[PDB]
Amino acid sequence: ATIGRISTGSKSLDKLLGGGIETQAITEVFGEFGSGKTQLAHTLAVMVQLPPEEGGLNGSVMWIDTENTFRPERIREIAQNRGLDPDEVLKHIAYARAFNSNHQMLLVQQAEDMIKELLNTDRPVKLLIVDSLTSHFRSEYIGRGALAERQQKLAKHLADLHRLANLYDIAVFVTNQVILAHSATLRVYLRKGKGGKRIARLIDGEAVFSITEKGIED
Ligand SMILES: c1ccc2[nH]ncc2c1
Q1: 132: preceding bond cis by omega (within 30 degrees)
Q2: Rounded to the nearest whole angstrom, what is the distance from the C-alpha of residue 111 to the centroid of ligand 1?
Q3: Ligand 1 atom closest to Cα of 107?
Q4: In which domain, by residue range, is 172 found?
Q5: E-strand spans in the chain?
Q6: Cβ(86)–Cβ(80) under 8 Å?
Q7: Looking at the 3D structure of the chain, how many domains does it have?
């Protein structure tokens, strides 16, 4: 199947990405606390629901939250300010809190059931968010011997996410608060800049955007 692209809300960031975030791929954003990773996730969860000529995929969303940072009212605000019904947009986000890394891994396997259910509806799942991908792994696997064990478990988790992305034509979007190896398709470094701006760079030009009542924008 042909790749789809989801606008981030920022023309600058969209250009950096080659046209938006891709289905059949895992895009990882990483950066320090406060760099805007979760705001970008909230914005994408709205943008994907737009029709294709407006930068979306007529898609639904699955969101796995490891830090209790999902904010339904932020979704509703972004949606309303972009002309979408806030309650319809929120209804199309399936939401789950992951309690630990083993639960997080099960939830990805569990997500396949809803993906299959919605696959031939008018709003199939097109975006799967894991925010944060790494927080539970970092807290649980620590000390001598943990590097190999943590990386091996993360590799399996990412393999599961790659399979869902590739098999069901979904964009997987993951966040990472930051010499270790990484298995995401594309890695985007986010940081704070001057004037409240955020700056994004591809890892392995730079886009600049603001966090606004519309989520993110130029
Ligand atoms: C991941 C994210 C959201 C979800 N809702 N139901 C199952 C599930 C898995």
Answers
A1: yes
A2: 5
A3: 9
A4: 1-218
A5: 5-6, 21-22, 25-31, 60-65, 93-97, 125-131, 171-177, 186-192, 198-203, 206-212, 215-217
A6: yes
A7: 1
For residue 121, the tally of other CB atoms under 10 A from its CB is: 10
Instruction: Sort 36 into a burial class: Cβ within 10 Å, 0-12 / 13-18 / 19+.
Output: buried
**Total residue count of the chain as it appears in this document:** 218
Q: Residue 72 C-alpha to ligand 1 middle, in angstroms?
A: 15
Solved how?
X-ray
Number of H helices, E strands in the chain: 7, 11
Return the best residue to mutate from 65, 97, 99, 110 for the ligand 1 pocket (most ligand atoms within 8 A of CB): 110
CA dist., res. 184 & res. 191, Å (int) = 19
In sequence order, which residues have a C-beta less than 8 Å from that of residue 149 and are 6 or more positions away?
Answer: 141
Resolution of the coordinates in A? Answer: 1.2
- Count the Cβ atoms, other than its own, within 10 Å of residue 106: 13
How many whole angstroms from 62 Cα to the centroid of ligand 1? Answer: 6
